[PDB]
Design an enzyme around this catalytic site. Structure first.
Site, PDB file in Angstrom:
ATOM      1  N   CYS A   1      37.831  41.848  42.166  1.00  0.00           N
ATOM      2  CA  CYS A   1      37.585  41.284  43.492  1.00  0.00           C
ATOM      3  C   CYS A   1      38.406  40.029  43.697  1.00  0.00           C
ATOM      4  O   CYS A   1      38.971  39.807  44.763  1.00  0.00           O
ATOM      5  CB  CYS A   1      36.103  40.939  43.643  1.00  0.00           C
ATOM      6  SG  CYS A   1      34.992  42.349  43.564  1.00  0.00           S
TER       7      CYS A   1
ATOM      8  N   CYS B   1      33.085  39.378  39.755  1.00  0.00           N
ATOM      9  CA  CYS B   1      33.943  40.560  39.779  1.00  0.00           C
ATOM     10  C   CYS B   1      35.417  40.170  39.635  1.00  0.00           C
ATOM     11  O   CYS B   1      35.989  39.570  40.537  1.00  0.00           O
ATOM     12  CB  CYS B   1      33.708  41.270  41.117  1.00  0.00           C
ATOM     13  SG  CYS B   1      34.738  42.696  41.484  1.00  0.00           S
TER      14      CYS B   1
END
Ligand code: NA
Length: 105
Positions: free
Chosen positions: A33, A30
């Protein structure tokens, strides 16, 4: 500063915490993230004594992710007294996160 939490210890570390808990749901794949990871670490320092900050890898802990409706990442959940009191979905700037968190202290 940020404890890594799993299916095994989520109840003890998050649900039974003596203070509010900010939970960062993330995975290695991600991009956003990875963007917020250092923000979360720095927020853990600022909120020492007031908010416990933990991270949960959703790839390794799909059960916790599913139980708490984590349909996308990044997602931050703020727990207080064992219940979700806020859900912060997607990347958000440091100041927006603080104001959302402050509201529950
Ligand atoms: Na998201």
């Amino acid at each position: 500063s940020v404890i890594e939490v799993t299916d095994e210890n989520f109840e003890q570390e998050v649900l039974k915490s003596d203070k509010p808990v900010l939970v960062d749901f993330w995975a290695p794949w991600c991009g956003p993230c990875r963007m917020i990871a250092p923000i979360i670490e720095e927020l853990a320092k600022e909120y020492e004594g007031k908010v416990k900050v933990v991270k949960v890898n959703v790839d390794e802990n799909p059960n916790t992710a599913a139980q708490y409706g984590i349909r996308s990442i990044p997602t931050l959940l703020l727990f207080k007294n064992g219940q979700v009191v806020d859900r912060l979905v997607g990347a958000q700037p440091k100041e927006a996160l603080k104001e959302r968190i402050d509201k529950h202290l």
